[PDB]
Design a protein around this ligand. Structure first.
Ligand SMILES: [Cl-]
Length: 324
């Protein structure tokens, strides 16, 4: 295939978060990471709900604040809108400006163990919120309040809006939901037992996962494929091979049919989903096991968090831009 060149691929930045001095350090590594839509921010969460933002490729520390009571557990997910950042915990949803100025706070009784959120049919004005529970909630982002509760038989681990709401259950199944009614349009059996990551563009769903969930005596086993679904034609595609075992995946923002696939050793494949033999390979050599991954809006910045509490940014040594 092709091996990527070092003139286009180098470690641009690294930060320890939470670092040994941090109060949440004892609770573990980063719980989630996400590039902002603006201001060249990368956001990182802790296992106790601290949020930190970091500027540019060198990840200069910017803002930092806790978004829910420590006892609520890990920061679950970020979402970004013009006015600020939405913060998801298991028992609440918090919104504040990027500077940390509070905007609203929702602590609803049906918020018992939330795990994921996504936008819906109303742009950035409305989000859907779900988790390992039998209820989902719809929230007006503008007014900062719950608008409706929805029952659900399937519990969810990932949510993302593209053409529809792509909803990974906690059983390796993907439900595709109508963005307005939230009813299940189609169910896609992506992996055997669990989904480890999901992303989606208007044309594709891509997932990583495996056939054996982690147990008390056995470690989790990831599949040697990225699974692919056609949103346009609403039908599954042939699995894209990934020998290093696919742990995380992101659709490339500016290459329509291309996905960025990462294994736990930090090995990355940039692969055309329609032509798998065409794929660039590159390595990042993280200190620990990679747990989370994201790509910036421009596609120029790649971020990876490991279980040694490091978060790295990779990209071209030339001038880079997270958001354009
Ligand atoms: Cl720190």
């Amino acid at each position: 295939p092709h091996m990527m060149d070092s003139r286009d691929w180098t470690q641009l930045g690294c930060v320890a978060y939470p670092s040994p001095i941090h109060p949440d350090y004892h609770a573990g590594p980063a719980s989630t990471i996400a590039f902002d839509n603006q201001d060249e921010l990368l956001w990182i969460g802790t296992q106790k709900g601290f949020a930190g933002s970091f500027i540019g490729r060198e990840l200069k520390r910017f803002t930092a604040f806790r978004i829910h009571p420590e006892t609520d557990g890990p920061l679950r997910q970020f979402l970004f809108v013009d006015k600020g950042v939405i913060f998801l915990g298991s028992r609440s949803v918090y919104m504040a400006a990027r500077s940390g100025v509070p905007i609203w706070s929702i602590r609803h009784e049906s918020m018992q163990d939330l795990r994921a959120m996504s936008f819906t049919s109303k742009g950035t004005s409305e989000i859907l919120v779900a988790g390992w529970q039998n209820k989902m909630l719809v929230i007006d982002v503008n007014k900062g309040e719950v608008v409706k509760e929805l029952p659900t038989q399937d519990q969810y681990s990932f949510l993302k809006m593209s053409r529809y709401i792509c909803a990974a259950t906690n059983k390796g199944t993907v439900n595709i939901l109508d963005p307005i009614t939230f009813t299940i349009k189609k169910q896609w059996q992506a992996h055997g037992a669990f989904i480890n990551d999901l992303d989606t563009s208007n044309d594709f769903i891509v997932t990583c996962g495996g056939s054996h969930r982690q147990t008390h005596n056995t470690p989790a086993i990831l599949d040697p494929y990225v699974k692919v679904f056609d949103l346009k034609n609403m039908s599954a595609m042939n699995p894209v091979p990934f020998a290093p075992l696919a742990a995380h995946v992101r659709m490339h923002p500016r290459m329509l049919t291309t996905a960025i696939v990462v294994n736990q050793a930090g090995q990355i494949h940039v692969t055309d989903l329609l032509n798998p033999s065409n794929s660039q390979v590159c390595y990042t050599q993280p200190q620990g096991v990679v747990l989370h991954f994201d790509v910036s809006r421009t596609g120029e910045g790649k971020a990876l968090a490991d279980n040694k509490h490091n978060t790295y940014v990779w990209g071209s040594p030339n001038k880079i831009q997270f958001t354009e």
